[PDB]
Point group: C3
Chain length 105, copies 3
């Protein structure tokens, strides 16, 4: 039983199975921790005004116990239609890209 | 050992256990990939102005290697109080709903 | 086989291994459900205007089949530079913090 809490070794091949599963779960949670932190940072922008010019959006964020840096840019044309798109950098292999559009009803 | 990398079969019933766990993990990660993509797309809006009318917010996004479509709408009354709410459609069984409010301090 | 669907018990110690893994997966998905709901709620704000004052941002959200409450606040100085930062409360042990900045290009 390894030390006490873990206790991966179970059978002739249960130790490798338990370790593999435990490693996969930790990897999923990690991607969500950093992935959410970066995504939020990007979704935390909104471009300050924009009657017909370009605006730079960027910022950092954090989730649970992780941190990520997100960036982006969009062009705010007129006061009726809009558009925003940027990329977020989380951890190492956790990258995401956004692209939405705002409109007045 | 299946092919080489996988190697699900372990014992008399380890093959089914390893496959079930591997399938569950992949399903969790998937929901996060599309779920985050859609959520972000919705959170990437902000409604262009709004002194006392309605605004339509919609857009698409992507995370890691997935894509989702999000939509929403809110009424921007006055220049002090606000409100935004919309729904996001990710994958197939990945739907989320938002509803927040902005205020000037 | 427990009841039918579950069927955790497999070997002399497979029941405990299957239960532990199944419990971990459910815990990961949970953190993502509430974590995404709260994060979105916070990222669903944008501060209504701000030429040189403070703005309070807060709201709730939901993902899949969960609900969370998020809050935050930032100071909107001038009509070129900006900043937003807040904290989101999800479930019980699912807390996140954001902090980004907007700028006109």
């Amino acid at each position: 039983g390894d030390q006490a809490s873990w206790s991966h070794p179970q059978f002739e091949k249960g130790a490798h199975k338990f370790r593999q599963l435990d490693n996969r779960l930790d990897k999923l949670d990690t991607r969500v921790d950093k992935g959410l932190a970066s995504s939020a940072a990007l979704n935390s922008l909104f471009q300050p005004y924009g009657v017909g010019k370009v605006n730079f959006t960027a910022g950092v964020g954090g989730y649970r116990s992780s941190q990520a840096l997100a960036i982006g840019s969009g062009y705010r044309v007129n006061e009726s239609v809009a558009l925003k798109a940027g990329v977020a950098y989380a951890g190492s292999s956790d990258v995401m890209y956004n692209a939405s559009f705002n409109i007045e009803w």
